[PDB]
Amino acid sequence: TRLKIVTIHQEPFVYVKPTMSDGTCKEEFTVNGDPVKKVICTGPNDTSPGSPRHTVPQCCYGFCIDLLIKLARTMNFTYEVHLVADGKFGTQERVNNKKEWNGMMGELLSGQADMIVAPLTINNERAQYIEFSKPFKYQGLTILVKKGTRITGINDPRLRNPSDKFIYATVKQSSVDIYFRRQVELSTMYRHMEKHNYESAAEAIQAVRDNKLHAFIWDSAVLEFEASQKCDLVTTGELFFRSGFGIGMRKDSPWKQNVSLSILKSHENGFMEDLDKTWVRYQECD
Amino acid sequence: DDNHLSIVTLEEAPFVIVEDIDPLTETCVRNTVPCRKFVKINNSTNEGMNVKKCCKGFCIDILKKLSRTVKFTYDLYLVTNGKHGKKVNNVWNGMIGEVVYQRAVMAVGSLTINEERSEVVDFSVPFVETGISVMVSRGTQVTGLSDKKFQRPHDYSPPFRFGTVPNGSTERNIRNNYPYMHQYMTRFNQRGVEDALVSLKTGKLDAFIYDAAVLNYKAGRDEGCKLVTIGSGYIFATTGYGIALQKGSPWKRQIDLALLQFVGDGEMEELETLWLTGIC
Ligand SMILES: O=C(NNC(=O)c1ccc(CNS(=O)(=O)c2ccc(F)c(Cl)c2)cc1)c1ccccc1
Ligand SMILES: N[C@@H](CCC(=O)O)C(=O)O
């Protein structure tokens, strides 16, 4: 059968652009001269929380799309890509006694998706419910601030002993959200961030540029790309907690072993590193 | 009985460290666990005896946590037929072999996850980040494995002298990706990490190519701190150490969830600082 692939907007792993007038993707090229492999992905345009979500065809490309294409050709399957409806990665929440998953996790479990191809963090909470591949990307957590902002890192007193003077945050219903909610010694930070968490990484990043957010805590694979691309931003403290991205599947999936073997092969034969060279970073800054 | 597992490991500090059980005393000290090692009587016999030894380290600490959390007891022993694992004439030896041929329920140690091993055993989630790094004297200019001094060694006079320890996952990778480099390297094969580090500091070797986690550990405890990784820190063929299990093992998902739990609740980072804090 045709695999329903869910993903999420997250540069440089997934770029999302409007189709052209005729409903096709504009032919574009990479920095190294290669053609950009684009696919048609349906998803909502209006991102407002609590609003109707009409799907329109759009254009997706990037690291994770190149991975999907490779996986599709390798294991001989066809796919339909769509963007997650609520725009979240996925956490488990009380409703109420009952609990539910949201985001891409929710869609994979409900059957709306057959596979998650996205910068999706592997953790205990998610692994209880779904099957992860071996990591296709080894990374961690870091902190994004505006250039000129000086903090030591995660143990800085302005984070550990917070006030309204210095605002920091992460993304709602993400793995970073789970991370600070679980650990009890991070409880003071979690209650600060809970007042300021953003709906998406792009918004939080823009908020840091606009001096509306002083510190954004997020995936380093993403934050380091942005800091290389936007010189008014920097990362500080560097990796304070390692994590990896994996392909998400139901525990029922017949693809799960061969997907993981394909990941391992791509790490070993240099294909993942070609993707890193193409998409992850290649530019500046000073 | 069903929760008493045959488990194999291999010495590689700081992940697995072997100590002589001291006589008079018969026990293993507080932070170590019993491990046995089959030692031959002579070379004209198959006769041997299991010597009781004591094991400790990062991976042993991991094994204890798993033993508590997943609820199993174990009989730990040290591999004698090869090391980590190599396919020789289509037959696995080392820790991979012990599992493949069902002499062990699992293998714990500095065991690198790669594709060909994942075909004959099941691996846990990676619990230690690793891959292939390059160790040099401080200042040495090499981009990494992809550097042309490695790729096309004889394009330089004199040729760059570099080598690895054979029969492991690092050699397997180089043989498959860089055929010329590989057949050039073989003359600079090292018997083990200690030999290689000595060859570096005495100028008999220009670079040592090996497992990243072990090299990073050795860089941080080098005297003079002039032996560094080439990144410094970056890695080729990123992967991890994993617990190896028999194909279709009933212990797999419990071990996975346990390891992930350790990561999320801080226990993993504390084992890191406990066993892998360097000076450099
Ligand atoms: O990598 C080490 N510890 N491991 C972790 O911090 C860790 C382990 C598991 C996970 C679970 N997610 S994963 O499988 O995708 C992953 C991500 C990054 C990693 F480095 C590893 Cl090993 C695994 C996350 C972090 C490490 C320990 C000592 C020295 C050098 C490295
Ligand atoms: N960790 C490696 C051994 C050292 C190496 O080959 O780099 C393995 O499991 O084979």
Side-chain angles (χ1 to χ4, degrees):
Chain A
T1 63
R2 224 174 183 211
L3 290 195
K4 267 139 268 195
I5 308 293
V6 67
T7 190
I8 192 174
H9 182 232
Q10 193 79 187
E11 305 179 357
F13 295 95
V14 178
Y15 290 82
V16 179
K17 300 299 179 191
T19 58
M20 289 192 303
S21 180
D22 63 339
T24 64
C25 317
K26 186 195 176 182
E27 256 287 347
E28 300 184 328
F29 298 98
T30 63
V31 53
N32 54 33
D34 295 326
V36 172
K37 304 188 195 64
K38 300 173 160 191
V39 325
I40 305 286
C41 62
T42 54
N45 34 34
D46 180 65
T47 73
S48 295
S51 300
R53 313 207 268 240
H54 300 102
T55 65
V56 55
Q58 294 172 86
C59 301
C60 299
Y61 54 91
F63 189 108
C64 287
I65 307 304
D66 281 13
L67 187 50
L68 168 61
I69 289 176
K70 159 68 89 172
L71 286 175
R73 178 185 66 90
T74 293
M75 301 165 53
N76 216 326
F77 65 83
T78 52
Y79 54 82
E80 284 166 5
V81 186
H82 75 263
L83 299 168
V84 55
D86 57 18
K88 305 295 178 301
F89 286 87
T91 55
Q92 204 178 23
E93 312 260 65
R94 232 150 260 121
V95 359
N96 327 85
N97 185 279
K98 178 189 239 294
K99 257 199 170 169
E100 90 182 324
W101 287 92
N102 54 61
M104 292 187 289
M105 287 292 305
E107 297 208 355
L108 177 58
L109 290 169
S110 64
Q112 294 167 81
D114 296 315
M115 182 173 295
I116 304 177
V117 179
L120 181 74
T121 292
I122 302 169
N123 63 25
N124 178 269
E125 294 75 0
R126 297 169 171 174
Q128 182 177 320
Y129 287 86
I130 68 161
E131 191 80 5
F132 282 101
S133 67
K134 285 296 187 300
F136 65 80
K137 177 67 178 169
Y138 292 78
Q139 66 133 22
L141 299 186
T142 188
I143 304 178
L144 189 83
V145 299
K146 189 191 228 337
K147 172 175 294 303
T149 307
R150 325 214 82 85
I151 58 181
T152 65
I154 193 64
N155 295 316
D156 194 285
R158 285 193 281 184
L159 308 197
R160 291 288 177 174
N161 188 32
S163 70
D164 61 311
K165 170 68 79 177
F166 193 91
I167 299 175
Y168 55 92
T170 187
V171 176
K172 277 187 175 185
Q173 293 178 333
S174 68
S175 60
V176 183
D177 189 28
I178 307 177
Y179 178 77
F180 282 85
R181 177 170 174 168
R182 174 198 41 247
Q183 293 186 85
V184 287
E185 59 276 29
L186 296 178
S187 67
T188 309
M189 301 187 62
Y190 173 73
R191 297 158 195 145
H192 176 95
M193 284 174 301
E194 196 175 15
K195 295 145 54 66
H196 306 89
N197 279 340
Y198 284 80
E199 300 288 351
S200 73
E203 294 182 54
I205 291 171
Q206 241 298 304
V208 174
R209 302 185 96 185
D210 293 344
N211 300 280
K212 258 170 179 178
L213 180 67
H214 306 98
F216 175 43
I217 304 178
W218 194 236
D219 296 319
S220 60
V222 171
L223 293 185
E224 291 163 347
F225 166 71
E226 296 281 10
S228 68
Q229 195 182 35
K230 298 158 187 173
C231 295
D232 48 321
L233 307 176
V234 291
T235 57
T236 54
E238 94 202 347
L239 308 197
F240 62 80
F241 179 81
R242 296 181 190 90
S243 65
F245 302 151
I247 307 293
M249 292 153 292
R250 281 187 298 274
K251 297 181 295 174
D252 170 49
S253 181
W255 309 101
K256 52 181 180 287
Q257 172 70 350
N258 292 343
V259 165
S260 210
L261 294 176
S262 178
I263 298 292
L264 297 186
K265 173 187 279 187
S266 295
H267 272 300
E268 294 165 34
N269 66 12
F271 180 81
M272 294 304 311
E273 183 188 59
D274 292 336
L275 295 187
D276 274 281
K277 184 176 290 186
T278 296
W279 294 108
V280 166
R281 182 224 163 273
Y282 47 88
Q283 187 268 354
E284 237 183 34
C285 279
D286 39 333
Chain B
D1 182 66
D2 278 339
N3 297 13
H4 186 86
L5 312 176
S6 179
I7 298 188
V8 66
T9 189
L10 168 75
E11 184 167 36
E12 184 154 53
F15 302 102
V16 178
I17 300 168
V18 175
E19 294 178 344
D20 293 340
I21 204 170
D22 80 338
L24 330 182
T25 273
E26 184 178 2
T27 40
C28 283
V29 288
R30 179 60 178 164
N31 84 309
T32 79
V33 307
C35 52
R36 53 179 174 88
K37 177 185 175 60
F38 185 73
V39 177
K40 278 139 59 184
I41 302 300
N42 60 71
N43 292 336
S44 306
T45 193
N46 289 316
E47 244 198 287
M49 279 181 57
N50 285 331
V51 180
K52 302 168 149 65
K53 311 197 79 59
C54 293
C55 288
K56 73 187 182 182
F58 185 92
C59 290
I60 304 298
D61 277 350
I62 287 290
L63 167 58
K64 291 195 283 183
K65 292 178 177 297
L66 292 175
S67 188
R68 308 172 204 146
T69 304
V70 189
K71 300 178 180 60
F72 62 81
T73 61
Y74 57 88
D75 190 330
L76 185 66
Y77 73 105
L78 291 154
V79 66
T80 46
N81 178 227
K83 287 171 56 176
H84 303 88
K86 189 189 181 183
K87 199 170 63 185
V88 183
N89 290 306
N90 213 29
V91 173
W92 283 102
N93 60 29
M95 287 193 285
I96 295 295
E98 299 298 300
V99 177
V100 166
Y101 293 100
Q102 293 179 336
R103 272 161 292 188
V105 176
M106 62 182 75
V108 190
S110 55
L111 187 55
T112 296
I113 298 160
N114 65 19
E115 187 186 14
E116 68 172 6
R117 289 172 180 180
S118 301
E119 292 177 354
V120 295
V121 303
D122 282 325
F123 275 109
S124 72
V125 284
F127 61 91
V128 172
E129 175 159 355
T130 189
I132 305 182
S133 291
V134 183
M135 170 161 285
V136 297
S137 285
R138 189 176 297 270
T140 296
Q141 326 81 357
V142 152
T143 70
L145 286 198
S146 51
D147 191 284
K148 299 315 138 181
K149 295 217 66 177
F150 290 150
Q151 305 269 299
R152 307 176 50 95
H154 284 127
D155 280 18
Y156 296 82
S157 280
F160 214 60
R161 307 161 310 174
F162 54 98
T164 186
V165 176
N167 304 331
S169 69
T170 293
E171 189 196 22
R172 173 59 54 184
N173 187 271
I174 296 186
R175 186 189 295 261
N176 290 345
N177 294 324
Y178 314 112
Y180 189 75
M181 177 189 314
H182 173 78
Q183 59 88 41
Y184 172 86
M185 287 184 72
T186 56
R187 61 165 299 177
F188 298 109
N189 282 348
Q190 309 285 306
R191 303 228 183 79
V193 178
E194 300 304 320
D195 287 26
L197 303 179
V198 169
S199 297
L200 278 175
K201 305 173 110 181
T202 66
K204 200 174 186 302
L205 202 63
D206 294 317
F208 177 45
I209 302 172
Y210 197 72
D211 175 83
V214 163
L215 287 192
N216 284 330
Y217 166 75
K218 287 294 185 182
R221 270 185 339 98
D222 184 46
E223 45 280 27
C225 301
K226 325 212 222 71
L227 291 190
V228 297
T229 51
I230 201 55
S232 170
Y234 280 60
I235 298 179
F236 306 81
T238 42
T239 184
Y241 293 167
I243 312 297
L245 292 150
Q246 295 186 2
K247 214 64 176 178
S249 173
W251 295 103
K252 179 178 174 47
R253 83 159 305 176
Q254 282 173 89
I255 292 299
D256 281 11
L257 295 183
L259 288 168
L260 291 178
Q261 175 210 326
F262 302 161
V263 172
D265 73 348
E267 294 181 28
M268 270 288 310
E269 184 228 47
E270 98 209 352
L271 283 188
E272 182 157 11
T273 65
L274 189 65
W275 291 100
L276 298 123
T277 40
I279 305 305
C280 312

